[PDB]
Design a protein around this ligand. Sequence first.
Ligand SMILES: C=C1[C@H](O)CC(=C/C=C2\CCC[C@]3(C)[C@@H]([C@H](C)CCCC(C)(C)O)CC[C@@H]23)C[C@H]1O
Lengths: 239, 11
Amino acid sequence: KLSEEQQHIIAILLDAHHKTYDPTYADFRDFRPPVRMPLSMLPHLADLVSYSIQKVIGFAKMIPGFRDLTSDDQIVLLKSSAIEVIMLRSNQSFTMDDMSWDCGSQDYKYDVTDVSKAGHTLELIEPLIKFQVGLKKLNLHEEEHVLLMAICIVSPDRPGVQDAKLVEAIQDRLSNTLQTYIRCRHPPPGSHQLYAKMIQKLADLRSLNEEHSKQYRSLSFQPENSMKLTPLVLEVFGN
Amino acid sequence: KNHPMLMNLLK
Ligand SMILES: C=C1[C@H](O)CC(=C/C=C2\CCC[C@]3(C)[C@@H]([C@H](C)CCCC(C)(C)O)CC[C@@H]23)C[C@H]1O
């Protein structure tokens, strides 16, 4: 059954998500405006991602055990996971109706052609949409969604990690919490192999991360594109 | 790292 500790973890993660995800998207007004007449969507989506990096950091900080990490280990975990967590969290605005991310208005509704106008090809974008579709098909409980974000961040195998054993221990605590949550709270048939499926999505995200990285390296190699980015994006994603 | 903004947002 779910221990008291485990239900505590869940409550904390739900709150941390509610504190860092504004389902009104009101802050989008502050971004450089979307332009859809090349790379016309890069300023707007660069800003979106920059905002989102900030929110993901604020979520990460609230993950039980995360603070016990070194500063260096917190830094490497966020650097490698940020894109993956933005892809994960983005699923909540994502809609199967038109395979787009719908952030409350036509201006902030993003489709495959918009992403394309930020400098990215179908080699990223097609697997990104399929990922969004498969995740949506899981119909996760919000509790599952926040746990999966946290397990994504606190991954022991990330490049640069120093205290692997400690990152492992934090994550195992969250993995066990997720496994037990599914067993106690998620009815069959939806529960069928749901943990393994959720772990497969984390492998999908590694692959998405790699592809995004290579297309980012290309895009940002040109200084006129790198200019349209934000300082946080350059720092977290590289230069 | 060499990551002042990240390090600052983290605490
Ligand atoms: C608040 C949020 C999330 O944090 C992010 C949201 C959407 C995420 C999207 C939709 C557009 C395409 C996005 C931005 C993807 C795109 C490949 C990022 C490109 C970043 C760049 C710096 C240009 O390489 C990643 C995640 C995708 C809206 C909303 O759900």
